Amino acid sequence: NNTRKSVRIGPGQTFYATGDIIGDIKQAHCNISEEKWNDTLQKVGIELQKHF
Amino acid sequence: VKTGTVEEMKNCSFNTTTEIRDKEKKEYALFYKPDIVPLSETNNTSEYRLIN
């Protein structure tokens, strides 16, 4: 939950940057389903078994 | 930060030119570590530069 600042440099042009942070600090993450991924991997494996 | 501390950001302060062509004021901003590189071989941990 970051917030933006406004620093003006030069004539009529501004540069944005992250300032303070409000709320507890946490870590970004990514999520995938396990069973679907395993089934897809097995399907790809059996399809690849023909060549090897 | 007020709520704690974060390891993936650094609080960098630097001088920037105002609307006046020759006049500088201090400003601050939080920057991610990968975009921060040590300046010179002189091991002065208080100085840094963008990766540019």
Partner: antibody
Framework: QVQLVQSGAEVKKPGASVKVSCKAS????????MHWVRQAPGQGLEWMGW????????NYAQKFQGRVTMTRDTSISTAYMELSRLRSDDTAVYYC????????????????????WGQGTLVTVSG | QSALTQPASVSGSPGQSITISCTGT?????????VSWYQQHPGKAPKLMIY???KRPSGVSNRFSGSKSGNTASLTISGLQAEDEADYYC??????????FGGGTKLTVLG
């Protein structure tokens, strides 16, 4: 069962500083936040702030910026709240409450659901 | 402060259904589903009665209930008894990792 206890009673001069200790048992102290609340006699109770015992981070509501400091001791699993610049209207009761679960993936500090409480502690400023 | 506006007191006879309201601006309760109702007897510490206004706690009877609509929540008690004589408060999440409590009320039993 889960148990929470605090100090018996405390009395201090006006404008002085006081400290309150709250201890918990029956569950892991590093797995949950800790909320602190104040209740004046016969008036609506006010929420002061919350503290995370893992990294020591704390947050407080307005009207208390810099006047109250909350820390903890993980080895003995206790929470300490220190207040300064007491006022005549500070005669009240204080309670510590167990909030949400520390997930490290989604924020849970702001959830207002806390169930386990303690007997509290009474503070008075006669003067 | 700009806490949650709440009535003063209510009353009802045993076996009667009585509801108490608690309202606030959109930021406090309108934009979020995080609400809680707390029961407090004199002297003893308060005890909570509902999670997110809908999910009931464990070990709590089915007499109490709660529901939110628009920018106001309502706590309903069915089958009043002598055990409900206590104070009731509404609290919610005010944004930016803050919690705000309501003014509170008192419940009286007729007869």
């Amino acid at each position: 069962q889960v148990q929470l206890v605090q100090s018996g009673a405390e009395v201090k001069k006006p404008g002085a500083s006081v400290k309150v200790s709250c201890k918990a048992s029956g569950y892991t102290f590093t797995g949950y936040y800790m909320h602190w609340v104040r209740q004046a006699p016969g008036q609506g109770l006010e929420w002061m702030g919350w503290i995370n015992p893992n990294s020591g981070g704390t947050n407080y509501a307005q009207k208390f910026q810099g006047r109250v400091t909350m820390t903890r001791d993980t080895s003995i699993s206790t929470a300490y709240m220190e207040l300064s610049r007491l006022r005549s209207d500070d005669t009240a009761v204080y309670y510590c409450a167990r909030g949400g679960w520390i997930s490290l993936y989604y924020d849970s500090s702001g959830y207002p659901n806390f169930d386990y409480w303690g007997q509290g502690t009474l503070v008075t400023v006669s003067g | 402060q700009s806490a949650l506006t709440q009535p003063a007191s209510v009353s009802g006879s045993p076996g009667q259904s009585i509801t108490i309201s608690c309202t606030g601006t959109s930021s406090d309760v309108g934009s979020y589903n995080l609400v809680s109702w707390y029961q407090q007897h004199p002297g003893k510490a308060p005890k909570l009665m509902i999670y997110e206004v809908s999910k009931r706690p464990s070990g709590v009877s089915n007499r109490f209930s709660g529901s939110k609509s628009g920018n106001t929540a309502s706590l309903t008690i069915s089958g009043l008894q002598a055990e409900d004589e206590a104070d009731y408060y509404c609290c919610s999440y005010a944004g930016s990792s803050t919690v705000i409590f309501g003014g509170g009320t008192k419940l009286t039993v007729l007869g």
